[PDB]
Write a protein that binds this DNA or RNA. Structure first.
Ligand SMILES: Nc1nc2c(ncn2[C@@H]2O[C@H](COP(=O)(O)OP(=O)(O)OP(=O)(O)O)[C@@H](O)[C@H]2O)c(=O)[nH]1
Ligand SMILES: [Mg+2]
Ligand SMILES: [Mg+2]
Ligand SMILES: [Mg+2]
Ligand SMILES: [Mg+2]
Ligand SMILES: [Mg+2]
Ligand SMILES: [Mg+2]
Ligand SMILES: [Mg+2]
Ligand SMILES: [Mg+2]
Ligand SMILES: [Mg+2]
Ligand SMILES: [Mg+2]
Lengths: 416, 51, 115, 212
RNA sequence: AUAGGUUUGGUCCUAGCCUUUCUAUUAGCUCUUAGUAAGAUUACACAUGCAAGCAUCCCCGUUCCAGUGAGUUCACCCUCUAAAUCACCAGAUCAAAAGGGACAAGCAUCAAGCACGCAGCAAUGCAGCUCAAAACGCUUAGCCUAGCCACACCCCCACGGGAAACAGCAGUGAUUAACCUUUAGCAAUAAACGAAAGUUUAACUAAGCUAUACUAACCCAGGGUUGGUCAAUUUCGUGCCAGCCACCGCGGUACAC
């Protein structure tokens, strides 16, 4: 019997009510997206997709999703594009249209989200917004300058010039889009990030899309369920409600949902547990079919018959998105012939005795991305010969991983 | 408030009188069981029987 | 557990199950837990009306008197139970609560008559 | 059975005893009041709501006795609460005084006197309680005769009270069982019991003191 | 135990092992309702919120309740006698410190302990005391459950130091096979406070979650097993392979997969 909880059918026109817009600031590394966000909020590498509910001088409220620009966080950029409904791409005319700029453009095309170009660093010399628009013409972003629909705004995030025009354009495009959602009924949303706080347990920063979330609701997402225990803002102050298009951190998660997973409100805890059991059973059936094919191959082989340079790595991250990014970087390994890379265990949270034990068992190395390892863990690692490597930057960690691969050998694997 | 004050005064007086009487009765019972005519008679009878 | 200070008190220890209260009148050290160690069980009290519309109270009057003599205090519910039993005078708060109830019902009746 | 001796326990116990003894706070510190916030700065604990008016508008016993020779020794001192709550003369004789000399104005201390509560004088002198309380007033030398001239009330009080119903029934039944057929009503003597009014001063000698 | 299966070519005896019974924890598969009972694996680390006030000022309480089981013959009996209650005293109740007796498990491949005794007012003198009827020593364990003992982050203690304390309630990270709400009210009982109306209380009460259990219902049953011990197999497929078994054992063209 199918017990899955599915998204409610599209909202009725009468039930629809105006809601705020969701804007993602995409772009390639160090094009001032962070500076623009800081200026808009009135407050050097981005590594987390951050949701902020900003209030404009007009009194409107807009949810900004600041995404990393580094090539590694393609998953983060894709998730931001999918969840958002407007993409305020930021491009530095001095640098010009780049690979990640085109990647963001393609993600916007997939998501079917209106794109607004913001020329950053327009104050600096050699800034050529006209050339930027020309180049975008090839990538199909036809700016209104060259007989198009895309609005291009010259700005200088550092000097805060024309940001008022950018905000006005964003508000106008939002009004044109006419975004609305049902504020009542079971809640629906998407997980923007998930992590483990030593105080608050498993937390998920999500963005509501329908209904209103409140303490005591039962949510289900992926193979996870929760009884909403604490809803908090970016600054942690508790909020009694989370209307559609509101970024909220939700505690009370029994299991840590995967980033980007859909969150749906169900009637009760037993119903949520039934849904989770059904989803786990579905995953089990899929994996069982795969294993059945493999086992049938092996058994045919057996019936007919009857007739080293290896690096084991544990990955520990501060957030599930970070862990996934490191996992993708690892999977981009291609030089298995000269040295093999094996991923013993990946997880979110500070280096734990279990991680140390796995490292000892497999002669592995623990790579902690934005995580700590208490003195007890350090002493145990020294005692057992494990090596812990705590890195705060993705490319620094990747460099260290490459160095270890070469030590095992330089490594032919180029992360790209 | 005044009526309740008076009631409590009288009630506590009566209860203290009762508690005095019960204390006296307890003291008299222990005094008797310890050094009364019956107890001393039993002790003397036991001693004489033993002899 | 060596308790500093304290003093014997004749009080009600709540036994029974949920939604089903029942009390054991126990002369216990005041600092001891409510349902814990007790010097002596001086009676019992079933606050729920039985098949005959009665709240059975049993008071081991002899031992109650002995403990009052030996210097035990009385919790307010126990004092009110004894007052109802007539072993003690009616408690001033029982009397005052009766009068408050009389006045409350009088107000209710007056308003019902007016409306 | 013999346990390893706990030397540090005794050491710390004696050290703490000595520190408490040598650093015991002075009355000037214990009984200091913040009239603006109505808190005792030493402990920082507010005073009960009902006492705010008296604290703001009344003076302490040693506060009055600081403006008298021999600190008012031999004078009669009354209390505002007593004056309000009674009609009979209420006052202490104030035989002895020992002020809090460290006090800036010598308005804290420790007094001894003979109480006259409701016009009944005690047969000895004892310490004054609630000295630190703010409800106090001085009986002027003149008008003292008018204040302290009291006419005793008749002492006709119920000598006996009826027993509680059930106790009376049990007593009568026990008597009849014993054999007596006397019909005299059982009664409960109340003369041995004297109901002191709830505001009669207690023994400041046994009353404890706040620590530091 | 009302016993059963198993040594062997076979019998008898001895003997271990396992089965049958009853609980509890965890796991797989599955599950409708209601009432009640019980509910971290860890003396590892803790975000957050609350958990002690009362009261005409002083005093009193926060030393209680609540918690955990690290440690562990401080619990029980007697002698004496503190503190506390009996409005003051009275002796009565309660119960410390002290003294006497009793007091878990295994290891003797722990057999010697090394001052562990006595007398004297003192000076000092004698050289003694415990032990194969288990001294001394190591390891393990909370116990004798109306409850009791012990601990309160560690240094046995806690002046001092290490350091910044949930073994209070809710909750969390780590850890484990083990995983309850970041509820409501002091209406009831208990405690603190007050002369009292009353105030406070994550004690407690009433709820929340969990087939862990008991009860009751259900007009929607799953789990396990079917060679023997042990209730119960039809046809196929495989063919000493896949696989199954608590013990004996089965599978080489199968009532055991
Ligand atoms: N001159 C100039 N510099 C700017 C302007 N806006 C931003 N910047 C700077 O350009 C850089 C932009 O990089 P960020 O936005 O901080 O980071 P990022 O884009 O995520 O890049 P990575 O985090 O390294 O992937 C920073 O040094 C900004 O301070 C601007 O208008 N003018
Ligand atoms: Mg940036
Ligand atoms: Mg089960
Ligand atoms: Mg233990
Ligand atoms: Mg050996
Ligand atoms: Mg702790
Ligand atoms: Mg300690
Ligand atoms: Mg807790
Ligand atoms: Mg946890
Ligand atoms: Mg369990
Ligand atoms: Mg066959």
């Amino acid at each position: 019997k199918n017990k899955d909880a599915v998204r409610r059918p599209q909202a009725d026109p009468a039930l629809l009510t105006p809601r705020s817009p969701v804007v993602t600031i995409m772009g390639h590394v160090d094009h001032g997206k962070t500076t623009l966000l800081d200026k808009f909020r009135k407050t050097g590498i981005t590594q987390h997709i951050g949701a902020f509910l900003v209030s404009l001088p007009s009194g409107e409220k807009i949810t900004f999703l600041d995404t990393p620009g580094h090539a590694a966080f393609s998953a983060m950029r894709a998730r931001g594009a999918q969840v958002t409904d407007i993409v305020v791409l930021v491009v530095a005319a001095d640098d010009g249209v780049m690979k990640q700029t085109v990647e963001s453009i393609q993600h916007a095309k997939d998501a079917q989200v209106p794109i607004i170009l913001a020329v950053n660093k327009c104050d600096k010399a050699e800034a050529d917004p006209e050339k930027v628009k020309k180049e975008l013409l090839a990538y199909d972003v036809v700016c209104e300058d060259y007989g198009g629909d895309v609005q291009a705004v010259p700005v200088s995030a550092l000097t805060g010039d024309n940001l008022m025009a950018l905000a006005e354009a964003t508000v106008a495009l939002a009004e044109m889009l006419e975004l609305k959602a049902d504020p009542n009924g079971p809640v629906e949303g998407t997980v923007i990030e998930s992590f483990t706080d030593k105080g608050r347990g498993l937390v998920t920063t999500a963005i509501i899309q329908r209904g209103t979330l409140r303490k005591g609701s039962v949510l289900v997402a992926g193979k996870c369920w929760a009884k909403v225990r604490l809803m908090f803002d970016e600054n942690g102050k508790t909020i009694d409600e989370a209307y559609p298009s509101m970024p909220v951190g939700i505690t009370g998660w029994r299991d840590l949902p995967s980033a980007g997973e859909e969150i749906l409100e169900v009637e009760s805890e037993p119903r949520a547990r039934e849904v989770v059991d059904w989803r786990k059973y579905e995953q089990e059936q899929e994996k069982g079919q795969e294993d059945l094919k493999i086992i049938e191959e092996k058994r045919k082989e057996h019936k007919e018959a009857h007739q080293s340079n290896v690096l084991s790595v544990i990955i520990k991250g501060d957030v599930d998105g970070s862990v996934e990014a490191i996992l993708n970087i690892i999977d981009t390994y291609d030089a298995s012939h000269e040295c093999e890379l094996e991923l013993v265990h990946f997880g979110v949270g500070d280096v734990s005795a279990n991680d140390v034990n796995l490292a000892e068992t497999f002669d592995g190395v623990i790579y902690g991305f934005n995580v700590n390892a208490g003195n007890v863990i350090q002493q145990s690692a020294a005692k057992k010969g494990v090596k812990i490597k705590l890195h705060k930057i993705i490319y620094r960690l990747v460099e260290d991983l490459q160095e270890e691969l070469s030590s095992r050998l330089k490594t032919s694997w180029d992360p790209g | 408030f005044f009526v309740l004050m008076e009631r409590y005064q009288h009630y506590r007086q009566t209860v203290r009188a009762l508690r005095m009487e019960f204390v006296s009765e307890v003291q008299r019972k222990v005094h008797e069981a310890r050094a009364g005519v019956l107890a001393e008679r039993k002790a003397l009878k036991d001693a004489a029987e033993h002899r | 557990k060596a308790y500093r200070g304290g003093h014997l008190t004749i009080r009600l220890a709540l036994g029974g199950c949920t939604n089903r209260p029942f009390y054991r009148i126990v002369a216990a050290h005041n600092k001891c837990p409510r349902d814990g160690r007790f010097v002596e069980q001086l009676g019992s009290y079933d606050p729920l009306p039985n098949s005959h519309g009665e709240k059975l109270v049993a008071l081991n009057l002899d031992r109650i008197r002995h403990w009052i003599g030996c210097g035990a205090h009385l919790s307010k519910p126990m004092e009110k139970l004894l007052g109802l039993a007539g072993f003690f005078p009616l408690h001033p708060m029982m009397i005052t609560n009766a009068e408050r109830l009389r006045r409350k019902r009088a107000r209710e009746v007056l308003l019902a008559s007016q409306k | 059975k013999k346990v390893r001796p706990r030397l540090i326990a005794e050491l710390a116990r004696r050290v703490r005893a000595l520190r408490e003894q040598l650093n015991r706070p002075r009355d000037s510190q214990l009984y200091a009041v913040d009239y603006e916030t109505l808190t005792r700065p030493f402990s920082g604990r507010r005073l009960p709501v009902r006492a705010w008016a008296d604290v703001r508008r009344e003076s302490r016993l040693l506060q009055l006795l600081g403006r008298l020779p021999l600190f008012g020794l031999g004078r009669l001192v009354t209390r505002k609460s007593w004056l309000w709550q009674h009609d009979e003369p209420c006052y202490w004789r104030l035989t002895r005084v020992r002020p809090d000399y460290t006090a800036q104005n010598l308005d804290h201390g420790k007094a001894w006197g003979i109480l006259t509560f409701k016009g009944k004088t005690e047969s000895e002198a004892r310490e004054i309680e609630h000295v630190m309380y703010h409800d106090w007033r001085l009986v002027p030398k003149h008008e003292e005769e008018a204040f302290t001239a009291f006419t005793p009330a008749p002492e006709d009080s119920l000598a006996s009270v009826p027993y509680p119903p059930l106790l009376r029934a049990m007593i009568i039944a026990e008597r009849q069982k014993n054999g007596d057929t006397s019909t005299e009503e059982p009664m409960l003597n109340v003369q041995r019991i004297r109901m002191e009014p709830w505001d009669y001063p207690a023994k400041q000698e046994d009353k404890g003191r706040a620590k530091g």
